[PDB]
Design a protein around this ligand. Structure first.
Ligand code: HEM
Ligand SMILES: Cc1cc([N+](=O)[O-])ccc1O
Length: 137
């Protein structure tokens, strides 16, 4: 289930982080508005950019911590405030995060692994709600 999935993802986190974020950007190409330097690149070209791998992994490092500190897929309010108040999220709305978790959930469903996709779907919905409660438009 959810906790085991965190362990699974952490066991190959650079690969999963890049592949899930690539699934996100390909499913929602307009989201490149927030990542202008990734425009005009293929998946393999992004995986060769040190910035891409570093940033992707740091994002998922934090995402797994938030997931890990959650109870029953409900994130801590403190984690939600951190996500809303970090300056790199200045322009973001909850729809950006929703789309990321849609892509994540569809990635797990398309995988042949026993991911608990329904728990990640709930986690995403509860994080979006916590973000709104913490002040994200
Ligand atoms: C649970 C979900 C997320 C977590 C835990 C998270 C975390 C982070 C972290 C840790 C960084 C800084 C890492 C670094 O500077 O190398 C970062 C930067 C950033 N994040 Fe997020 N993030 C999340 C979702 C999103 C989403 C959905 C978007 C946009 C659709 C987004 C847009 C950005 C941008 C634009 C930056 C800075 C620019 C860049 O690094 O290229 N984040 N985020
Ligand atoms: C800013 C950023 C975020 C993510 N992410 O996984 O959210 C991946 C690559 C990036 O450059």
């Amino acid at each position: 289930g959810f906790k085991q999935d965190i362990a699974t993802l952490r066991g190959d986190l650079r690969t999963y982080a890049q592949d899930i974020f690539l699934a996100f950007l390909n499913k929602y190409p307009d989201e490149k508005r927030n990542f202008k330097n990734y425009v005009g690149k293929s998946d393999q070209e992004l995986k060769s950019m040190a910035k891409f791998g570093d940033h992707t992994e740091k994002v998922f490092n934090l995402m797994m911590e938030v997931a890990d500190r959650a109870t029953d897929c409900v994130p801590l309010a403190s984690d939600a405030s951190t996500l809303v108040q970090m300056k790199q999220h200045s322009g973001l709305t909850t729809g950006n995060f929703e789309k990321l978790f849609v892509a994540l959930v569809e990635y797990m469903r398309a995988s042949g692994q026993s991911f608990d996709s329904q728990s990640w779907d709930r986690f995403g919905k509860n994080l979006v709600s916590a973000l709104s409660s913490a002040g994200m438009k």
